[PDB]
Write a protein that binds this ligand. Structure first.
Ligand SMILES: N[C@@H](C[C@]1(C(=O)O)C[C@H]2OC[C@@H](O)C[C@H]2O1)C(=O)O
Length: 256
């Protein structure tokens, strides 16, 4: 039989979450979400079983000043996993070091905050001095700011980086808690903003999308699975299955 593929992933609602059960769950059964459904579909099409393993460092992946990676990206570079199936953003810097499938979803960075302020854009947010802001450490949103040559975003990066211990959060849950309990706005991806703002009516998006990009399945460079996964994604796309999966995991409207 074909070797069981190792899948690196990360907890991120509603892509990957612990299943709620009153009885013990083991192995893959512990998890559910859009990305687990995606894996069930991909594995049927490609003919494999898999072992889902949460990334040990809890990070998506960024490189330090020495060019050393962490998170799921490092797991792929180091051939610790066969696939990364997660809301993993397809970026220029990552594409040079891993192979991504074609995208299964598109999104852009925007701002999550509480309601009640006149802040209407990133320009507004960068200019004012009352509300702090940041991003999840070692993800693509942090990297977007670090690499930007747009003045507003360069200033925002300098601010986040100056207050890195403060401004850059460990994960999306910490970021959202910070938004809810302190004067802090979180830079994050639009599909996640859509999800949370339909569940907690104290939260809102500020402004529009600042960029546009996709999520893809990651594989190590040269992986014989990447093209097969791309073909499977296109199948699911064209059959309307990806659309159905989005509806299943995002439904339904909870806030005015
Ligand atoms: N998709 C990103 C990770 C992350 C980000 O950098 O925005 C962290 C986490 O942040 C909350 C929401 O944006 C979903 C997740 O995206 C990545 O692939 O690095």
């Amino acid at each position: 039989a074909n070797r069981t593929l190792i899948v690196t992933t990360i907890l991120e609602e509603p892509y990957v979450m612990y299943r709620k059960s009153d009885k013990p769950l083991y192995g893959n059964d512990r998890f559910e979400g859009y990305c687990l459904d995606l894996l069930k579909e991909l594995s049927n099409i490609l003919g494999f079983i898999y072992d889902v393993k949460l990334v040990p460092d809890g990070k998506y992946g960024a490189q330090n000043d020495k060019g050393e990676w962490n998170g799921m990206v490092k797991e792929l570079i180091d051939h610790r996993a066969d696939l990364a199936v997660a809301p993993l953003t397809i970026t220029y810097v990552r594409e040079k070091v891993i192979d991504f499938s074609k995208p299964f979803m598109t999104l852009g960075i925007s701002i999550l905050y509480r309601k009640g302020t006149p802040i209407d854009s990133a320009d507004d947010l960068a200019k004012q001095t009352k509300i702090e802001y940041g991003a999840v450490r070692d993800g693509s949103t942090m990297t977007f700011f670090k690499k930007s040559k747009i003045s507003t975003y360069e200033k925002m990066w300098a601010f986040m980086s100056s207050r890195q211990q403060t401004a850059l959060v460990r994960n999306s849950d910490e970021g959202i808690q910070r938004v809810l309990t302190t004067d802090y706005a979180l830079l994050m991806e639009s599909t996640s903003i859509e999800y949370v703002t339909q569940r907690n009516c104290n939260l809102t998006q500020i402004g529009g999308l600042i960029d546009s990009k996709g999520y893809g399945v990651g594989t190590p460079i040269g992986s014989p699975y990447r093209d097969k996964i791309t073909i499977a994604i296109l199948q699911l796309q064209e059959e309307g299955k990806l659309h159905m999966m989005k509806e299943k995991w995002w439904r339904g409207n909870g806030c005015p």
